[PDB]
Design an enzyme around this catalytic site. Structure first.
Site, PDB file in Angstrom:
ATOM      1  N   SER A 237      26.518  43.214  26.985  1.00  0.00           N
ATOM      2  CA  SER A 237      26.754  42.608  27.982  1.00  0.00           C
ATOM      3  C   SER A 237      25.257  43.211  28.887  1.00  0.00           C
ATOM      4  O   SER A 237      24.639  42.703  28.770  1.00  0.00           O
ATOM      5  CB  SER A 237      28.654  43.372  28.438  1.00  0.00           C
ATOM      6  OG  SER A 237      28.713  43.204  29.551  1.00  0.00           O
TER       7      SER A 237
ATOM      8  N   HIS B 142      35.118  38.336  25.942  1.00  0.00           N
ATOM      9  CA  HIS B 142      33.553  39.785  25.865  1.00  0.00           C
ATOM     10  C   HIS B 142      33.465  41.270  25.339  1.00  0.00           C
ATOM     11  O   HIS B 142      34.293  41.993  26.152  1.00  0.00           O
ATOM     12  CB  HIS B 142      33.271  39.584  27.156  1.00  0.00           C
ATOM     13  CG  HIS B 142      32.231  40.263  28.279  1.00  0.00           C
ATOM     14  ND1 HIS B 142      31.552  39.461  27.246  1.00  0.00           N
ATOM     15  CD2 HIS B 142      31.729  41.011  28.843  1.00  0.00           C
ATOM     16  CE1 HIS B 142      29.972  39.849  27.987  1.00  0.00           C
ATOM     17  NE2 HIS B 142      30.376  40.517  28.569  1.00  0.00           N
TER      18      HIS B 142
ATOM     19  N   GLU C 192      34.053  34.309  26.025  1.00  0.00           N
ATOM     20  CA  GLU C 192      33.256  34.652  26.893  1.00  0.00           C
ATOM     21  C   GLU C 192      33.629  35.389  28.237  1.00  0.00           C
ATOM     22  O   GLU C 192      33.654  36.654  28.786  1.00  0.00           O
ATOM     23  CB  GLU C 192      32.017  34.240  27.201  1.00  0.00           C
ATOM     24  CG  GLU C 192      30.644  34.746  26.218  1.00  0.00           C
ATOM     25  CD  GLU C 192      30.469  36.248  26.170  1.00  0.00           C
ATOM     26  OE1 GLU C 192      31.128  37.206  26.273  1.00  0.00           O
ATOM     27  OE2 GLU C 192      29.746  36.218  24.328  1.00  0.00           O
TER      28      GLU C 192
HETATM   29  N1  TZ5 Z   1      41.337  46.973  44.682  1.00  0.00           N
HETATM   30  C1  TZ5 Z   1      39.624  47.088  44.049  1.00  0.00           C
HETATM   31  C2  TZ5 Z   1      39.572  48.782  43.919  1.00  0.00           C
HETATM   32  C3  TZ5 Z   1      37.864  48.337  43.163  1.00  0.00           C
HETATM   33  C4  TZ5 Z   1      37.284  47.511  42.544  1.00  0.00           C
HETATM   34  C5  TZ5 Z   1      38.819  46.475  42.319  1.00  0.00           C
HETATM   35  C6  TZ5 Z   1      39.444  46.238  42.901  1.00  0.00           C
HETATM   36  C7  TZ5 Z   1      37.300  45.469  41.263  1.00  0.00           C
HETATM   37  C8  TZ5 Z   1      39.018  44.527  41.022  1.00  0.00           C
HETATM   38  C9  TZ5 Z   1      39.435  44.911  39.714  1.00  0.00           C
HETATM   39  C10 TZ5 Z   1      40.657  43.995  39.631  1.00  0.00           C
HETATM   40  C11 TZ5 Z   1      40.114  42.575  40.388  1.00  0.00           C
HETATM   41  C12 TZ5 Z   1      39.420  42.224  40.378  1.00  0.00           C
HETATM   42  C13 TZ5 Z   1      38.497  43.352  41.073  1.00  0.00           C
HETATM   43  N2  TZ5 Z   1      36.367  45.673  40.545  1.00  0.00           N
HETATM   44  C14 TZ5 Z   1      35.733  45.047  39.428  1.00  0.00           C
HETATM   45  C15 TZ5 Z   1      36.328  44.336  38.154  1.00  0.00           C
HETATM   46  C16 TZ5 Z   1      35.604  43.763  37.918  1.00  0.00           C
HETATM   47  C17 TZ5 Z   1      35.226  44.042  35.820  1.00  0.00           C
HETATM   48  C18 TZ5 Z   1      35.008  42.716  35.109  1.00  0.00           C
HETATM   49  C19 TZ5 Z   1      34.811  42.975  33.648  1.00  0.00           C
HETATM   50  C20 TZ5 Z   1      34.095  44.132  33.061  1.00  0.00           C
HETATM   51  C21 TZ5 Z   1      33.064  43.540  33.385  1.00  0.00           C
HETATM   52  N3  TZ5 Z   1      31.840  44.667  32.342  1.00  0.00           N
HETATM   53  N4  TZ5 Z   1      32.861  45.673  32.263  1.00  0.00           N
HETATM   54  N5  TZ5 Z   1      33.973  45.637  32.938  1.00  0.00           N
HETATM   55  C22 TZ5 Z   1      34.709  46.745  33.071  1.00  0.00           C
HETATM   56  C23 TZ5 Z   1      35.998  46.877  32.045  1.00  0.00           C
HETATM   57  N6  TZ5 Z   1      34.550  46.759  31.587  1.00  0.00           N
HETATM   58  C24 TZ5 Z   1      35.113  45.796  30.485  1.00  0.00           C
HETATM   59  C25 TZ5 Z   1      33.594  46.132  29.678  1.00  0.00           C
HETATM   60  C26 TZ5 Z   1      33.775  44.771  28.101  1.00  0.00           C
HETATM   61  N7  TZ5 Z   1      34.609  44.510  28.321  1.00  0.00           N
HETATM   62  C27 TZ5 Z   1      35.984  43.814  28.965  1.00  0.00           C
HETATM   63  C28 TZ5 Z   1      36.676  42.988  27.930  1.00  0.00           C
HETATM   64  C29 TZ5 Z   1      38.098  43.363  28.778  1.00  0.00           C
HETATM   65  C30 TZ5 Z   1      38.115  44.273  29.650  1.00  0.00           C
HETATM   66  C31 TZ5 Z   1      37.422  45.175  30.014  1.00  0.00           C
HETATM   67  C32 TZ5 Z   1      35.869  45.239  29.811  1.00  0.00           C
HETATM   68  C33 TZ5 Z   1      32.778  44.738  26.738  1.00  0.00           C
HETATM   69  C34 TZ5 Z   1      31.624  45.177  28.274  1.00  0.00           C
HETATM   70  C35 TZ5 Z   1      31.817  46.975  29.000  1.00  0.00           C
HETATM   71  C36 TZ5 Z   1      32.710  46.775  28.938  1.00  0.00           C
HETATM   72  C37 TZ5 Z   1      35.700  47.222  40.983  1.00  0.00           C
HETATM   73  C38 TZ5 Z   1      34.371  47.217  41.324  1.00  0.00           C
HETATM   74  C39 TZ5 Z   1      33.228  48.017  40.898  1.00  0.00           C
HETATM   75  N8  TZ5 Z   1      32.059  48.485  40.944  1.00  0.00           N
HETATM   76  C40 TZ5 Z   1      33.819  49.003  42.350  1.00  0.00           C
HETATM   77  C41 TZ5 Z   1      35.614  48.368  42.337  1.00  0.00           C
HETATM   78  C42 TZ5 Z   1      36.163  47.393  42.040  1.00  0.00           C
END
Ligand code: TZ5
Length: 537
Positions: A203, A442, A329
């Protein structure tokens, strides 16, 4: 010093370290966890490039993982394995610049190839101490030296006022680079060969590996690279100087900071770490998925030009890369704020929910371009079918953000002299807790590459264990020789290099290697050749 394991005392440039003898299924490994590689980037050092760790006296204890860099802790589904496994497993601190080393036990007599892991997490999260990044299996089974580093994420790592002295941007990448110099100087002490260093990452980690490929000073610190499900080019991994200024300024404003850059940064500095985290998602220009607030910036320094321009014009003769993608993905991103989607139901969406989802997935896009995506991803035989709409939504996100940017990185490095090997990872872990509809999401190959299925206490099938051994074998063969194929092995089916003429890649699953041709060739011609021009007019 006298009464402890003689095999766990090592000296580095900064002084003496005591490691820990860990147990792995096949036998013992040496671990040296939490080695400081930089001065703590705290106080007046926030937002600033890392400075080399100053020497310490006495024996530094290196038996446990150190703090995780300050970050937003994921709470979408509290208690849920599927999200918690990515959440920090050590306390959050700005004092977080530490790296980890796993080596065989006893340490290898002759210089061993080094693997360096860079974690993902959208440049806003992640840690080198997560269970899925445990180096003990590769260390023990493949006899490899594995290094992983913490690097600053979110604002602390990527907030930039481009052109300023006090917040140049890209400091999280600079943390990574400093850990790489640390390996150059110190890894020989653990029996690593600093002349044989392979970067690998997934990623944002992959995107990072890619940026080191494209940045001159970094190029002299490694020899090979693996990019898993991420690229430096693409819609999310970088931002223009202009946009990074806009975001830094907006965040500044949101936390009560006013006009020049010095005053502004001094004020940010000043702010409690949590206040910065609490406001970072608010600076995004449009409601969106697979976009992150604070990411590497095209500064004209670390990145001398856009990753697109640099891959189009670079000479990659002496480079060998392994790149690839997982089957699904996009699917994971959907549960994080695409209306319609959930882990707890089939996510059978409506046409309205899809058009709405396309706007969110391609943010970015004019009305016309959105119409193009929709038209291209609709099945015109069943244009209202919720199963297909759900899967198309997934594919839209997956194709636009990962598959297609990988498709050119590959095609483009190959056209300019690189040896490239491509894969699609297609196996869904028997132990996976996400629903079936998400397919192979992912990040879900990492546990196999790192050989977790070899831990009998983990309940993986047999099967999956043989499979994990195969992948570890491909990866370390690549680290070792620039070629994933087994030199001596006559019978086992060959992994051919990716070329522009043949566009070959392999499927990685429980069956033996199958060679396919063309990485979503037809669809990636849309995202890589047509959409850009449609976005011009
Ligand atoms: N109410 C609020 C308040 C603050 C924040 C909020 C919401 C959200 C949010 C949560 C749910 C829906 C929409 C938005 N996000 C955004 C999150 C978007 C994350 C997308 C998924 C992702 C992609 N890379 N890393 N991650 C985070 C989780 N770690 C994972 C990782 C990996 N794969 C996966 C697979 C499934 C689930 C998680 C995941 C692989 C690589 C590393 C991390 C934030 C992001 C921020 N940087 C700060 C605050 C907030």
């Amino acid at each position: 010093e006298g009464r402890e394991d003689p095999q766990l005392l090592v000296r580095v440039r900064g002084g003496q370290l005591r490691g820990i003898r860990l147990k792995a299924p096949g036998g013992p490994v040496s671990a040296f966890l939490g080695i400081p590689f930089a001065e703590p980037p705290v106080g007046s050092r926030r937002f600033m490039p890392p400075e080399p760790k100053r020497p310490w006296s006495g024996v530094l204890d290196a038996t446990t993982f150190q703090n995780v860099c300050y970050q937003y802790v994921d709470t979408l589904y509290p208690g849920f394995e599927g999200t918690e496994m990515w959440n920090p497993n050590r306390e959050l601190s700005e004092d977080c610049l530490y790296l980890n080393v796993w080596t065989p036990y006893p340490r290898p007599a002759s210089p061993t190839p080094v693997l360096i892991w860079i974690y993902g997490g959208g440049f806003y999260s992640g840690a080198a101490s997560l269970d899925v990044y445990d180096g003990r299996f590769l260390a023990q089974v493949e006899g490899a030296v594995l290094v992983s580093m913490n690097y600053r994420v979110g604002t602390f790592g990527f907030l930039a006022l481009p052109g300023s002295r006090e917040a140049p941007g890209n400091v999280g990448l600079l943390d990574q680079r400093l850990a790489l110099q640390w390996v150059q100087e110190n890894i020989a002490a653990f029996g690593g060969d600093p002349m044989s260093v392979t970067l690998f990452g997934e990623s944002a980690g992959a995107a990072s590996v890619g940026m080191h490929i494209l940045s001159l000073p970094s190029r002299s610190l490694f020899h090979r690279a693996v990019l898993q499900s991420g690229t430096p080019n693409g819609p999310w991994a970088t931002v223009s100087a202009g946009e990074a200024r806009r975001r830094a300024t907006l965040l500044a404003r949101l936390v009560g900071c006013p006009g020049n850059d010095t005053e502004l940064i001094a004020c940010l500095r000043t702010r409690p770490a949590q206040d910065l985290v609490d406001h970072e998602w608010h600076v995004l220009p449009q409601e969106s998925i697979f976009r992150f607030s604070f990411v590497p910036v095209v500064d004209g320094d670390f990145l001398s030009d856009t990753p697109e321009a640099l891959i189009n014009t670079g000479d990659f003769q002496d480079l060998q890369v392994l790149v690839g993608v997982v089957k699904d993905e996009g699917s994971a991103f959907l549960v994080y704020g695409v209306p319609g989607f959930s882990k707890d139901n089939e996510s059978l969406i409506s046409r309205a929910q899809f058009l709405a989802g396309v706007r969110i997935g391609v943010p970015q896009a004019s009305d016309l371009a959105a119409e193009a995506v929709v038209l291209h991803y609709t099945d015109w035989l069943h244009p209202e079918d919720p199963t297909h709409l759900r899967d198309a939504m997934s594919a839209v996100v997956g194709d636009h953000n990962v598959v297609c940017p990988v498709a050119q990185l590959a095609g483009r490095l190959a056209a300019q002299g690189a040896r490239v090997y491509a894969y699609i990872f297609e196996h869904r872990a028997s132990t996976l807790t996400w629903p079936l509809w998400m397919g192979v999401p992912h990040g879900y190959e990492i546990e196999f590459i790192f050989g977790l299925p070899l831990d009998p206490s983990l309940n993986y099938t047999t099967e999956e264990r043989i499979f994990a051994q195969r992948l570890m074998k491909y990866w370390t063969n690549f680290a070792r020789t620039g070629d994933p194929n087994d030199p001596r092995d006559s019978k086992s089916p060959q992994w051919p290099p990716y070329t522009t003429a043949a566009q070959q890649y392999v499927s990685l699953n429980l069956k033996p290697l199958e060679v396919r041709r063309g990485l979503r060739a037809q669809t990636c011609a849309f995202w890589n050749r047509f959409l850009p021009k449609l976005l011009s007019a």
